[PDB]
């Protein structure tokens, strides 16, 4: 039975979806256990128009597993513990010299400028999580567990692996930004390299 | 030592070597061999050990008085395909017999299990069950 | 199998 | 059609719904006939 | 053009105008640090996006076995005859079939377009 | 796939077109309209070109080479070296300076190739932008003799003054963010 | 002079045991860490288990179940989940507070990737002139936290509901 | 002066320390005895405009290790110790980083293969049983 | 084993990496996990391929791919990757030589087989992702030999082009002289034949 390759980053463009470009990665825990969990990083299209919306233009969002609502990406990076804007961009953009990529990242940073606390970001992820959250303490611990295990398991599942997950998430974002800029071609689903 | 214009013979010699060593259905056989040899044992080892204790039995002082039972599975063993008759006498099961008698070609699966009892009596006993 | 205007 | 130097008599759109909103139901009868005849006769086939 | 991050809080600096002095100041929202802006340009958008791909090309691509190589076009910098030549290889490159030549040979790393 | 190049247009034919006609879909896959020219416009190719320009949607984004938002406290200062000459000429007899001058500046460069292809005029574009945004936008346009076509846009001088004693501290979008929103709206929906 | 051709060779010593364990403290270059202003510092294990692990089971635990009800209460809580984990400090991150509350605060996290095939040693000058090598017990990467006003979580939720903040964000921060 | 105070005297003295990445065979050779107070000699030879660092394995221990330097300007590193008396201290600031590489190229792969086999010993595999267990 | 070797061969780990240094270095992914970056990619790539061809540490199935334009090296040890064996070309000369086919010809009483060919480095298994980085020659003698220059950097050669066909299509005689749908139809009819 043919299946799409796991533990890889694939960027596709979906016309119907509100996201102009969507980058998905399906992660499995070295095939040892657990179902494969897919995490999507998507960029909203500039077609949506508003006084603030047109100014921000393209804004990156992430569909973390087991969280019902889309989460802004800068919030995910802050939830991992990288609070500073410069450090988040350091993980996302490997060379700060290029202006275009930084311009792409700017709107998403503006959207998440309300949240500057790691605990607050974790609470926000828990609150918008599909599973109900009774209190702030419970929501924070639940969202931390989701980030530790459910999201990007192949990078790590325990052992304080937040830095590795942050770098791989930033790689997904970097590839999405390159696709949006047009520097990298969008991946093809039919290639038999991808079809294990 | 280059092979010029003798290539039609040489290419089919190397192709023949490939097909002699590796059959046409080698993928299925190799994957199943990987399953049995490695994956079954790794699945047994990956499973967390079973931890069991009583629910404050006897309503005594209960200073961890309920015993703790720990089970850890290890060292999975597979026998050759075997068919047990109505008498219960084990016997090897040839494939054709399985086809004719509508039997299922299967092999027994055995696991070593280690059971530890911790009753807070200052002594822990780790009995081992072989080839369960 | 012929051309772009024909058939595949 | 309103733009100057565009013939109002002959200008035609392939969309039948636009023909209905602009020109009327009879015009759509004729336009739908024309479009169906184009799809049928492109291969050279003929239907009465 | 470029984005400047404040030293005090390591966050993005957003443009702000001081009405009293009519001086552009890049000030973080989170922290009070303010910096005068030398560039004096806030936002630049190139709709034509006529950006040369010569800068983007990596000199490492010369090592590729699959790339075609021409000895017809000599290198300008060092005169090495061999030069792998490849097209834009870029999405949103509009309609360009220009060949972006890359000089082979170790460490020359010269990229020219003819 | 097996139409011809003679059509020189995307055309839906065959089973999908049959389904579109049968189902009377509101949106055809390839809506098309055949325009027949009335008189001399049909005879002469140039007149037909004029009609084409009249019939094809054109926005500022199509004719704009690049846009840049600058901060210039003084219009006479002319932070950009190039605009010094024409800004000085315009401010020799300044118009709307009495109200005020907005410090933030939007500078738009229009590609000459696209401008001449659609036969647009700098004065025409200025008039259209002025009409679309009323007096909230003040536009300065170069002469066609200038090698680079430059349009300079600033926020309303009356709006910059706010013409209000209270002045309201709301300070919506300040002026730079408002200028960015204006740029996006102009590029998308100018309909020149 | 002798500096252009000097050859220095020193003995290497590796004591079997050291009273003080050796760790690595790594600061990011962009942080511009400076020790001249480090008059005082406080390094201690974190208490974030207050928020998410312990003393969070304070009120319900000491509510006052007794007798059969006590037995059932304890057993029910235990079997409900898998016994909540408490403080085990040695396996928790480190918090650094330089110059008390006034100065910057850093957080160190143990390097998750273990060095199963690598070891790290530190060479220090000593009066005897021989290098001494000490194994690296742990690696810590410290990242600072700005000593700026932090948005309250409730206020942050309220603000995020108005995701379309047409008004300037800087004024909003000033209001808080 | 408190329990949580960090003794920054090493930072004040600006004591310079060197960080080195060394392989497991070397560390395990050192750990074998680990109590003799000696494992080898570090020899540094400097020329007009080039410096080389090498380590010689002790003759008893064996029964050449060139060192490659790495730039430390991209990250600032310091060493701190947690005393058994709960008195944290700072030893110094890292001023140079180095890596130790094996001399043997191919025969060293033999020792690497032996290490791989040793690490694979705990790996357990399904065992074929000839006779069904009764 | 591959991760251990990579650590030996000067691969800086992501945790120890200064964020600025990543931009100029290639990223090494093993089974889809970004292990670290390497400052000099080509030397590492050549070493990995040598190890695989000698079957020392890297198994034959393990596939190394280097994307030169994107500065990424990807190593896949995953299962389910589909691979085909290809002859190896060094310079413009096939590595397979007359001595190898002489040993193979007397396959009986010489215990020389396909495994010996793989271990000798004459042939190699290449999956599709690695096929993207490989210059192949349909026929060795024709394409390797010097002619009007088309490619002088062939890295692999096909054993025989007729091996692209499957089991049922291989029984078709002169398949290249037929229309394609007819070969497809014969593939289905052959399954239903009597014998
Ligand atoms: Zn700041
Ligand atoms: Zn050159």
Distance A99 CA to ligand 2 centre (A): 29
Structure token pair of residue H35: 């109590």
Structure token pair of residue A72: 């802004």
Q: What gap in Å lies between CA E99 and CA E85, rounded to an integer? A: 6
Q: CA of A110 to nearest chain F CA: how many angstroms apart?
A: 13
Give the resolution in Å. Answer: 6.1
Structure token pair of residue A38: 């897919």
Q: Which of A57, A26, A30, A45 is nearest to A172 (CA)?
A: A26
Chain A interface includes I42 (CB < 8 A): no
3-state secondary structure chain A: CCCECCCCEEEECCCCCCEEEEEEEEEEECCCEEEEEEEEEEEECCCCCCHHHHHHCCCEEEECCCCCCCEEHHHHHHHCCCCCHHHHHHHHCCCCCCHHHHHHHHHHHHHCCCCCCHHHHHHHHHHCCCCCCCCHHHHHHHHHHHHHHHCCCCCCCCCCCHHHHHHHHHHHHHHHHHHHHCCCCCCCCCCCCCEC
Chains that touch I (3 or more CB pairs under 8 A): A, B, E, G, H
Structure token pair of residue I117: 């060919």
Distance A115 CA to ligand 1 centre (A): 16
Q: Which of A83, A87, A60, A75 is nearest to A143 (CA)?
A: A75
CB burial class (10 A; 0-12, 13-18, 19+) of residue F105?
buried
CATH, range A8-196: 3.90.1110.10
Distance E37 CA to ligand 1 centre (A): 15
The edge-to-edge listing of strands for the beta sheet with F64-71 is E41-45, F64-71, F104-110, F149-155, F137-141
Q: What gap in Å lies between CA G160 and CA G154, rounded to an integer? A: 10
| A abuts G (3+ Cβ pairs < 8 Å) | yes
Which ligand is closest in space to the CA of residue E7? Answer: 1
Domain segments of chain F: what residues?
Answer: 47-189
> Does residue I103 contact residue I116 with C-beta atoms inside 8 Å?
yes
Phi, psi of H126, deg, nearest 5: -60, 135
Q: Which of I132, I4, I8, I125 is nearest to I70 (CA)?
A: I132
Question: Residue E103 annotated as binding?
Answer: yes
Phi, psi of E60, deg, nearest 5: -70, -20
Q: What gap in Å lies between CA I105 and CA I107, rounded to an integer? A: 5
I128 interaction partners in chain A (CB closer than 8 Å): 191-193
Q: CA of B43 to nearest chain A CA: how many angstroms apart?
A: 8
* H103: helix, strand or coil: coil
> Does residue E75 contact residue E108 with C-beta atoms inside 8 Å?
yes
Q: CA of B77 to nearest chain H CA: how many angstroms apart?
A: 5
Please indicate whether, in this complex, the C-beta atoms of G117 and I4 are within 8 angstroms of each other: yes
Q: What gap in Å lies between CA D36 and CA D14, rounded to an integer? A: 11
Q: What gap in Å lies between CA I53 and CA I60, rounded to an integer? A: 7
Q: Which of I26, I34, I36, I33 is nearest to I6 (CA)?
A: I36
Strands I156-157 and I136-137: parallel
For A192, name the nearest residue in chain I, comparing CA atoms only.
I128
H89 interaction partners in chain G (CB closer than 8 Å): 20
> Does residue H76 contact residue G24 with C-beta atoms inside 8 Å?
no
Question: Residue E28 annotated as binding?
Answer: yes
Structure token pair of residue B90: 């084990």
Q: What gap in Å lies between CA I40 and CA F51, rounded to an integer? A: 61
Q: CA of E26 to nearest chain G CA: how many angstroms apart?
A: 12
Domain segments of chain A: what residues?
Answer: 8-196
Report the topology of domain E46-114.
N-terminal domain of TfIIb (2.20.25)
CB burial class (10 A; 0-12, 13-18, 19+) of residue I142?
exposed
Q: What gap in Å lies between CA A160 and CA A145, rounded to an integer? A: 12
| G abuts E (3+ Cβ pairs < 8 Å) | yes
Q: How many CB atoms lie within 10 A of CB A72?
A: 24
Q: CA of G161 to nearest chain F CA: how many angstroms apart?
A: 19
> Does residue I176 contact residue I169 with C-beta atoms inside 8 Å?
no
Please spell the DSSP secondary structure of D1-48, one letter per residue: --STTB-TTT-EES-HHHHHHHT-HHHHHHHHHHHHHHHHHTTS----
CB burial class (10 A; 0-12, 13-18, 19+) of residue I182?
exposed
Choose among A85, A179, A184: nearest Cβ to E12. Answer: A85
Question: Residue E41 annotated as binding?
Answer: no
Chain B interface includes G155 (CB < 8 A): no
Q: What gap in Å lies between CA E30 and CA E9, rounded to an integer? A: 8
| B abuts C (3+ Cβ pairs < 8 Å) | no
The sign of the torsion formed by the CA atoms of H120, H124, H125, H129 equals positive
Please indicate whether, in this complex, the C-beta atoms of D35 and F37 are within 8 angstroms of each other: no
Q: How many CB atoms lie within 10 A of CB I113?
A: 16
> Does residue A71 contact residue A125 with C-beta atoms inside 8 Å?
yes
Per the DSSP assignment, residues forming a β-bridge with B128 are: B114
Q: What gap in Å lies between CA F108 and CA F123, rounded to an integer? A: 14
**Who's near B42: CB < 8 A, 6+ residues apart?**
A32
Distance E65 CA to ligand 2 centre (A): 18
Our measurement of the distance from residue E104's CA atom to the centroid of its chain's CA atoms, rounded to an integer in Å, reads: 22
Please indicate whether, in this complex, the C-beta atoms of A86 and E92 are within 8 angstroms of each other: no
F35 interaction partners in chain D (CB closer than 8 Å): 6-7, 11
Q: CA of B31 to nearest chain A CA: how many angstroms apart?
A: 13
In chain F, alpha helices (H):
15-23, 40-43, 45-55, 60-63, 84-92, 112-117, 122-133, 157-161, 176-189
> Residue A33: which region, alpha, beta or left (left: phi > 0; alpha: psi -120 to 50)?
beta
Which ligand is closest in space to the CA of residue E6? Answer: 1
Chain B interface includes I94 (CB < 8 A): yes
Domain segments of chain E: what residues?
Answer: 1-45, 46-114
Please indicate whether, in this complex, the C-beta atoms of C7 and F2 are within 8 angstroms of each other: yes
Q: Which residue has the tokens 């990956």?
A: B46
Distance E25 CA to ligand 1 centre (A): 12
Q: What gap in Å lies between CA B17 and CA A95, rounded to an integer? A: 51
For A159, name the nearest residue in chain G, comparing CA atoms only.
G112
* H77: helix, strand or coil: strand
Q: Which of G106, G84, G82, G103 is nearest to G95 (CA)?
A: G106
> Does residue E9 contact residue E28 with C-beta atoms inside 8 Å?
yes
- Containing I129, the helix (H) or strand (E) segment is helix I128-131
Q: How many CB atoms lie within 10 A of CB F41?
A: 21
**Who's near H88: CB < 8 A, 6+ residues apart?**
G43, H4, H5, H6, H7, H80, H81, H82
Distances (CA, A) of A160 to A148, G93, G154, I31: 8, 9, 28, 21
User: Which of E15, E39, E42 is the mutation pick for testing F, counting most F CBs within 10 A?
Assistant: E42
G26 interaction partners in chain H (CB closer than 8 Å): 75-78
| D abuts I (3+ Cβ pairs < 8 Å) | no
CATH fit for domain F47-189, picks 3.30.413.10, 3.30.870.10, 3.10.180.10, 3.30.1360.140: 3.30.1360.140
The sign of the torsion formed by the CA atoms of B75, B80, B85, B89 equals negative
Phi, psi of F133, deg, nearest 5: -105, 10
> Does residue A29 contact residue F156 with C-beta atoms inside 8 Å?
no
> Does residue G138 contact residue G129 with C-beta atoms inside 8 Å?
no
Number of residues that make up chain I:
195
Q: CA of F16 to nearest chain C CA: how many angstroms apart?
A: 18
Chain B interface includes H45 (CB < 8 A): no
Per the DSSP assignment, residues forming a β-bridge with F50 are: none
Please indicate whether, in this complex, the C-beta atoms of G75 and B59 are within 8 angstroms of each other: no
Phi, psi of A77, deg, nearest 5: -65, -40
Please indicate whether, in this complex, the C-beta atoms of E24 and F66 are within 8 angstroms of each other: no
Chains that touch A (3 or more CB pairs under 8 A): B, E, F, G, I
CA-angle at G99, arms to G94 and G103, nearest 5°: 85
Q: What gap in Å lies between CA D10 and CA A85, rounded to an integer? A: 62
> Does residue H68 contact residue H98 with C-beta atoms inside 8 Å?
yes
Q: Which residues of E32-57 are buried (b: 16+ CB within 10 A; e: fewer)?
A: eeeeebeeebbbebebeeeeebeeeb
Per the DSSP assignment, residues forming a β-bridge with I38 are: I26
Q: Which residues 46-105 of G have a C-beta within 8 angstroms of I?
A: none
Distances (CA, A) of G124 to G176, H56, H84, H86, H94: 50, 19, 20, 22, 10
| Contacts of range D29-34, beta carbons closer than 8 Å, 24 or more positions apart | D32/F21
**Who's near D10: CB < 8 A, 6+ residues apart?**
F36
Q: CA of I141 to nearest chain B CA: how many angstroms apart?
A: 7
Taking 3-state DSSP, the helix, strand and coil percentages for chain F, each rounded to the nearest 5, stand at 40, 15, 45
* Greatest Cα pair distance in chain D: 39
For A178, name the nearest residue in chain I, comparing CA atoms only.
I70
Q: Which of I79, I80, I52, I54 is nearest to I65 (CA)?
A: I52
Chain A interface includes B131 (CB < 8 A): no
Q: Which residues 28-47 of G have a C-beta within 8 angstroms of I?
A: 28-29
**Who's near A93: CB < 8 A, 6+ residues apart?**
A101, A102, A105, A174, A177
> Does residue B52 contact residue B116 with C-beta atoms inside 8 Å?
no
Q: What gap in Å lies between CA A4 and CA B96, rounded to an integer? A: 38
Please indicate whether, in this complex, the C-beta atoms of F181 and A54 are within 8 angstroms of each other: yes
Per the DSSP assignment, residues forming a β-bridge with B112 are: B74
Please indicate whether, in this complex, the C-beta atoms of E30 and G148 are within 8 angstroms of each other: yes
Q: Which residue has the tokens 């204790």?
A: B53
Chain F interface includes A116 (CB < 8 A): no
């Amino acid at each position: 039975q043919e299946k799409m390759a796991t533990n890889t980053v694939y960027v596709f463009a979906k016309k119907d979806s509100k996201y102009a470009y969507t980058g998905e990665c399906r992660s499995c825990l070295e095939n040892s256990s657990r179902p494969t969990s897919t995490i999507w990083v998507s960029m909203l299209a500039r077609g949506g128009q508003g006084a603030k919306k047109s100014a921000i233009g393209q804004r990156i969002v992430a569909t973390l597993p087991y969280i019902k609502q889309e989460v802004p990406i800068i919030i995910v990076f802050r939830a991992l513990g990288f609070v500073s804007d410069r450090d988040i961009l350091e993980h996302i953009i490997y060379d700060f010299e290029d202006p275009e990529m930084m311009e792409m990242v700017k709107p998403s940073l503006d959207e998440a400028f309300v949240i500057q606390e790691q605990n607050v970001a974790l609470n926000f992820i828990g609150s918008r999580g599909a599973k109900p959250g009774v209190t702030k303490e419970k929501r924070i611990k639940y969202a931390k567990e989701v980030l530790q295990k459910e999201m990007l398991p192949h990078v790590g599942v325990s052992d304080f692996c937040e830095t590795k997950k942050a770098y791989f998430l930033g790689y997904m974002v970097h590839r999405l930004l390159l696709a949006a800029l047009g520097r990298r071609e969008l991946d093809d689903r039919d290639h038999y390299g991808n079809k294990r | 030592e280059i092979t010029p214009d003798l290539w039609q013979e040489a290419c089919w010699i190397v192709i023949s070597s490939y097909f002699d060593e590796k059959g046409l259905v080698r993928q299925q056989l190799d994957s199943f061999d990987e399953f049995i040899q490695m994956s079954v044992q790794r699945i047994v080892e990956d499973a967390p050990p079973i931890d069991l204790q009583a629910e404050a039995q006897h309503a005594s002082g209960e200073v961890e008085e309920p015993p703790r039972y720990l089970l850890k599975f290890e060292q999975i063993y597979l026998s050759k395909p075997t068919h047990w008759e109505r008498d219960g006498a084990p016997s090897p099961m040839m494939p054709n017999e399985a086809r004719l008698r509508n039997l299922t070609y299967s092999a027994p699966l055995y696991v070593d299990i280690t059971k530890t009892v911790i009753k807070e009596g200052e002594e822990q006993l780790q009995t081992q069950h072989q080839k369960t | 199998i012929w051309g772009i205007g024909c058939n595949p | 059609l309103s733009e100057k130097d565009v013939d109002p008599v002959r200008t035609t759109s392939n969309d039948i719904v636009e023909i209905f909103t602009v020109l009327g139901i009879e015009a759509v009868r004729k336009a739908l006939e024309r479009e169906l005849y184009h799809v049928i006769s492109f291969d050279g086939s003929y239907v009465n | 053009v470029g984005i400047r991050f404040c030293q005090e809080c390591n966050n993005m600096l957003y443009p702000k105008e001081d009405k009293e002095n009519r001086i552009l100041l890049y000030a973080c929202r989170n922290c009070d640090y303010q910096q005068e802006a030398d560039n004096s340009c806030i936002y630049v958008n190139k709709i034509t996006h006529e950006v040369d791909e010569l800068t983007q090309i990596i000199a490492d691509v010369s090592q590729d076995p699959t790339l075609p190589r021409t000895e017809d076009h000599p290198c300008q910098k060092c005169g090495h005859k061999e030069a792998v030549f490849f097209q834009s290889h870029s999405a949103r490159a509009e309609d360009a079939m220009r060949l972006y030549y890359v000089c082979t040979a170790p460490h020359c790393g010269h990229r020219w377009t003819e | 796939f097996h139409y011809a190049g003679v059509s020189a247009k995307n055309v839906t034919l065959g089973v999908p077109r049959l389904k579109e006609l049968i189902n009377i879909s509101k949106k055809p896959k390839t809506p098309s309209l055949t325009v027949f020219l009335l008189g001399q416009s049909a005879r002469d190719a140039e007149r037909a070109k004029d009609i084409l320009c009249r019939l094809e949607h054109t926005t500022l984004r199509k004719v704009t080479a690049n846009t840049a938002i600058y901060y210039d406290p003084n219009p006479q200062s002319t932070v950009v070296a190039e605009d010094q000459e024409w800004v000085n000429v315009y401010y020799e007899m300044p118009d709307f300076d009495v109200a005020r001058i907005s410090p933030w500046l939007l500078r738009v460069e229009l590609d000459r190739k696209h401008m001449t292809d659609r036969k647009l005029t700098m004065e025409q574009i200025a008039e259209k932008i002025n009409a679309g945004f009323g007096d909230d936008l003040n536009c300065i346009f170069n002469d066609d003799n200038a090698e680079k076509l430059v349009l300079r846009i600033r926020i309303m001088n009356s709006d910059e003054n706010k013409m209000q004693e209270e002045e309201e501290v709301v300070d919506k979008m300040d002026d730079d963010v408002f200028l960015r929103c204006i740029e996006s709206n102009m590029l998308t929906d100018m309909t020149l | 002079g002798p500096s252009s051709q000097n050859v220095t060779e020193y003995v290497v010593r590796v004591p079997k045991n050291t009273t003080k364990k050796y760790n690595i403290m790594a600061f990011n270059a962009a942080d511009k860490v400076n020790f001249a202003t480090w008059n005082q510092a406080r390094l201690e294990r974190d208490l974030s288990n207050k928020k998410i692990y312990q003393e969070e089971e304070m009120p319900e635990s000491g509510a006052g179940s007794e007798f059969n009800r006590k037995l059932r209460e304890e057993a029910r809580r235990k079997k409900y989940g898998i016994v909540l984990k408490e403080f085990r400090p040695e396996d928790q991150p480190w918090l650094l507070r330089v110059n008390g509350k006034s100065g910057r605060k850093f957080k160190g996290i143990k390097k998750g990737g273990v060095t199963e095939n690598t070891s790290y040693y530190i060479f220090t000058q000593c009066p005897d002139g021989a290098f001494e090598a000490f194994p690296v017990h742990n690696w810590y990467n410290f990242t600072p936290l700005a000593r700026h006003r932090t948005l309250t979580a409730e206020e942050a939720e309220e603000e995020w509901e108005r995701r379309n903040k047409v008004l300037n964000h800087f004024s909003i921060m000033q209001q808080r | 002066a408190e329990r949580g105070e960090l003794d920054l005297t090493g930072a004040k003295q600006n004591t310079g320390v060197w960080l080195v990445k060394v392989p497991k065979y070397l560390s395990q050779q050192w750990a074998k005895a680990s109590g003799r107070g000696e494992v080898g000699k570090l020899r540094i030879a400097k020329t007009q405009g080039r410096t080389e660092v090498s380590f010689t394995l002790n003759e008893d221990l064996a029964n050449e290790h060139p060192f490659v330097l790495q730039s430390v300007g991209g990250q600032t590193l310091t060493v701190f110790t947690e005393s058994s008396s709960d008195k944290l201290s700072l030893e110094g600031i890292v001023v140079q980083r180095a890596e130790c590489r094996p001399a043997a190229s191919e025969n060293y792969m033999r020792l690497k293969r032996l290490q791989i086999e040793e690490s694979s010993k705990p790996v357990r595999l399904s065992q074929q049983l000839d006779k069904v267990v009764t | 084993p591959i991760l251990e070797f990579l650590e030996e061969w000067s691969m800086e780990n992501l945790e120890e990496i200064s964020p600025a240094a990543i931009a100029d270095a290639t990223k090494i992914f093993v089974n889809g996990c970004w292990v670290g970056i390497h400052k000099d990619p080509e030397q590492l790539m050549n070493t990995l391929r040598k190890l695989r061809r000698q079957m020392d540490i890297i198994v034959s199935e393990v596939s190394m791919i280097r994307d030169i334009r994107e500065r990424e090296i990807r190593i896949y040890t995953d299962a389910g990757r589909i691979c085909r064996p290809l002859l190896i070309v060094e310079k413009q000369k096939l590595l397979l030589k007359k001595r190898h086919i002489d040993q193979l010809k007397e396959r009986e009483y010489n215990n020389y087989s396909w495994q010996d060919l793989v271990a000798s480095g004459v042939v190699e298994y290449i999956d599709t992702l690695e096929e993207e980085t490989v210059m192949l020659a349909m026929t060795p003698d024709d394409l390797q030999e010097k002619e009007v220059a088309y490619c002088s950097t062939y890295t692999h050669c096909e054993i025989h082009p007729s091996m692209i066909l499957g089991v049922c299509a291989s029984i078709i005689p002169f398949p290249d002289h037929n229309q394609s749908p007819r070969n497809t139809y014969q593939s289905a009819m052959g399954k239903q034949a009597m014998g």
